[PDB]
Structures are given as structure tokens and as C-alpha cells.
């Protein structure tokens, strides 16, 4: 950690940023456009 | 019954022109004139 000028704070920040479950809404979610035919969830970042 | 009150309203245009954050203004006003509870301390074995 000292060799690369890092600390446990950097490790915690990286773990929290890169290991997370993110909610991202949907495709064609309500209120939808007139004549919308597609509805699907969006899958964003997921836990390692 | 209703009583007089001092109405101080911030100006968004002027605050932004001078580069003053509304959060800073509100925190300054509140902490100065109403008081803020920041944290605790331990005196004689009691959290105060």
C-alpha cells in the first residue's frame, strides 16, 4: 500500500464504488408513450 | 394569536453571482441565530 501511495481509505472507496447493486429504472416505464409495446427492467452494476 | 416575525429571504440571483452557496447561507444563519448541536463529549463519565 505504501509502495503505490495508497491506504485502506482508498481500498474502502474502491470496494464501495465497484461492488454495489444499482437500481436503474425500466424501459417503457409508466407513464408510457402512446402505443408503447416494450417493457423491460434495466440491469445496472451488480455485486461481485 | 398571530404575531410579527422577521422574514429574511435570500436572493438566488445575487447569491449565485457572488458565488455563495445557499447551503452555506442557511447553515450560517441557523447555527448563528438558533444554535446547532454538533456532537457529544464525555465529561465525568457522561455523554454530554
Amino acid at each position: 500500500l505504501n509502495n503505490f501511495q495508497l491506504t485502506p481509505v482508498d481500498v474502502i472507496s474502491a470496494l464501495k464504488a465497484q461492488n454495489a447493486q444499482v437500481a436503474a429504472g425500466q424501459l417503457g416505464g409508466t407513464p408510457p408513450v402512446k402505443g408503447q409495446q416494450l417493457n423491460a427492467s434495466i440491469i445496472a452494476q451488480t455485486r461481485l | 394569536e398571530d404575531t410579527p416575525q422577521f422574514k429574511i429571504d435570500i436572493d438566488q440571483e445575487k447569491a449565485q453571482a457572488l458565488g455563495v452557496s445557499i447551503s452555506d447561507i442557511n447553515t450560517t444563519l441557523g447555527a448563528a441565530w438558533g444554535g446547532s448541536y454538533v456532537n457529544d463529549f464525555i465529561d465525568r463519565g457522561r455523554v454530554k
Binding site: 409508466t30 407513464p31 | 438566488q12 440571483e13 449565485q16 453571482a17
Partner: protein, 48 residues
């Protein structure tokens, strides 16, 4: 309180002095928290 007050929120000030407000980059209106459930009574609009 109103939608007119919300549409007057100042986001940033352009270099040429023109101001950008919420109504300039959005469309503010009173609407349901969720547009998911939609009830009808004998074919009429309803809620319950």
C-alpha cells in the same frame, strides 16, 4: 408550493448573463407519485 415556483428554480447563470431555470430544462406539473395502478369503476375513471 406551486408549479410556477418550482419552474423558477435557478440552475446556473450563463456567461452572457442569461439565466437557466428549471422550466428551461424540464416540464413541471402535478402528477401521481406512481403511474402504475389505474382503477376503473364500470368503465369510468375511479379510485378507491
Amino acid at each position: 408550493t406551486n408549479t410556477e415556483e418550482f419552474g423558477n428554480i435557478l440552475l446556473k447563470v450563463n456567461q452572457d448573463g442569461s439565466q437557466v431555470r428549471l422550466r428551461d430544462v424540464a416540464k413541471i406539473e402535478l402528477g401521481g407519485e406512481s403511474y402504475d395502478v389505474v382503477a376503473k369503476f364500470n368503465g369510468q375513471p375511479a379510485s378507491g
